[PDB]
Structure formats: structure tokens, C-alpha cells
Amino acid sequence: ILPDSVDWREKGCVTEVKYQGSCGASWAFSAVGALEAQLKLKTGKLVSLSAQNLVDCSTEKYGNKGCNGGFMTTAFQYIIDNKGIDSDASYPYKAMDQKCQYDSKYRAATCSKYTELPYGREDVLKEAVANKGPVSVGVDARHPSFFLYRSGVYYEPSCTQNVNHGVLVVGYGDLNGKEYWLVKNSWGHNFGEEGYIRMARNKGNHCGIASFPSYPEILQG
Ligand SMILES: CC(C)(C)OC(=O)N1CCC(CC(=O)N2CCc3c(c(-c4ccc(Cl)c(I)c4)nn3CCCN3CCOCC3)C2)CC1
């Protein structure tokens, strides 16, 4: 029996909401967000990791296209291959494609492995959020209602299971008669609930939230 609700912000495992601007780098923010939580669990320190590092350096070999989109899972593979990722402080976000400037002197995290969860399984996603930490997911965000969301549990009848926007599931719950996923976005603090959106849960893989989940791990050693 899983907890009725989870919120990894309450364990100090979630950094401030970021603002991607005109650069389509949500995949990079989702990836660093998932890795930030594992880093805090392992080291006790909460430090924002460089989404710009991924935009500039996790490119064609990883199937990623910087400000034109990418994947959280291949971002994790880049961090594994590169043996590190810089802090956001040392390598801050510029919302444009730049030359790779990774510097091991400012490495703030590593990645050992990642896990991909099965397509559409919200029960498996619930277990991973409860037992492993925040989970990178894609959602279908191509609806005016998503851009216009302010509060409550989001439900868009015309949503599809085909994803196009990377976000971070940091928890789940059940409030006001509605089950939801707690989602950290990267559209700044003025979007939604202080930068978060609660999305309908157990409504048939609504907006594809459980289509392509993945999470990284940092192992001892
Ligand atoms: C007409 C053509 C043939 C072009 O497409 C279709 O027929 N489609 C379009 C795609 C539809 C399915 C779908 O949503 N995804 C296709 C499969 C997919 C998508 C995402 C994903 C995750 C997070 C985010 Cl944020 C985003 I953004 C995407 N992860 N994965 C899993 C494999 C990713 N790869 C990356 C490279 O290394 C190998 C593994 C998007 C099905 C219908």
C-alpha cells in the first residue's frame, strides 16, 4: 500500500522553478530536476544543475537538438558518458544554443544509470514517485488550456498521449475529490500554482503523463 500523497518539495529535494523562455529546453530542465533530487538524497545538498550544459553539450549523438527539443533519457546518458554535469551557478541558463563549455572543475553531479518506466502505467509511475523520487515525464502541452492554467487539477478533454513537453513529476495526491500528479514546469513562477501544475491522475494516461517516464540514479562510489 502506497502513501495517499507524496510531495518531494517537503523533503527539500526540489530546486526553484526555472524559466525556459523562448528556448525549447524543457527536456533539459526536466532532466536536471530529476537528477537534483537524487543528488540531495545522496549528499544532503540541494544545488541546481546546469540545463545549459545539456542544451550545449548533449546534442546530435544523443538525438537532442538544444533549443529545438530533446529527450530526458538521452540527457541522462550524456551525463553518464561525460562523467559529470556542472552546477547551474557555474554554467547558467541563457535560453539559446551555445558552444559546449563543460568544465570538470565545476562538476556538481554525476549519473550512474537511468530507468525507463513502461508506457501508460500510472500505477508503476505512482510507485516510482513514492519509492524512488521525482520522475521525468513528457506531457501533451499543446492546448491553450495548458498555457492558461492557473490553479486546480488540470483536465483537458482533447489531450493526447503523444508528448511534446518535458516536465518533472514531484508528487501526487487527492484533493477536492480529484486525484492528481504534482508537476514542476519550467515556465517560471507566474505559471500555474507558483510554477507547478496538478494534472489529472488515473484518467487513462491523461495528456500522456505516463507515456515516457524515466528517472536517474547516483550510486555509492
Ligand atoms: C510520424 C512519425 C513517424 C514522425 O511519428 C509518429 O508516428 N509519431 C510521433 C511520436 C509518437 C510517440 C511519442 O510521443 N514519442 C516517440 C517515442 C518517444 C518520445 C519520447 C519523449 C520523451 C520526453 C519528451 Cl519531453 C519528448 I518531446 C519525447 N520518448 N520516446 C521514447 C524513445 C525516445 N528515443 C530518443 C532517441 O533515442 C532512442 C529513444 C516521443 C508516436 C506517433
Swiss-Prot record:
Principal subcellular localization: other
Cysteine disulfide links: C13-C111, C23-C67, C57-C100, C159-C207
Cellular compartments annotated: Lysosome; Secreted; Cytoplasmic vesicle, Phagosome
GO molecular function: collagen binding; cysteine-type endopeptidase activity; cysteine-type peptidase activity; fibronectin binding; laminin binding; proteoglycan binding; serine-type endopeptidase activity
UniProt-listed Enzyme Commission number(s): 3.4.22.27
Keyword Disulfide bond attached: yes
List of catalytic residues: S26, H165, N185
Name of the top EC class for this enzyme: hydrolase
Record-level GO BP terms: adaptive immune response; antigen processing and presentation; antigen processing and presentation of exogenous peptide antigen via MHC class II; antigen processing and presentation of peptide antigen; basement membrane disassembly; cellular response to thyroid hormone stimulus; collagen catabolic process; extracellular matrix disassembly
Keyword Protease: yes
Cellular component GO terms held in the UniProt record: collagen-containing extracellular matrix; endolysosome lumen; extracellular region; extracellular space; ficolin-1-rich granule lumen; intracellular membrane-bounded organelle; late endosome; lysosomal lumen
Catalytic reactions on record: Similar to cathepsin L, but with much less activity on Z-Phe-Arg-|-NHMec, and more activity on the Z-Val-Val-Arg-|-Xaa compound
Domain of life: Eukaryota
Family: Belongs to the peptidase C1 family.
Subunit structure as annotated in this protein's UniProt entry: Monomer.
Official protein name in the record: Cathepsin S
Gene symbol of the encoding locus: CTSS
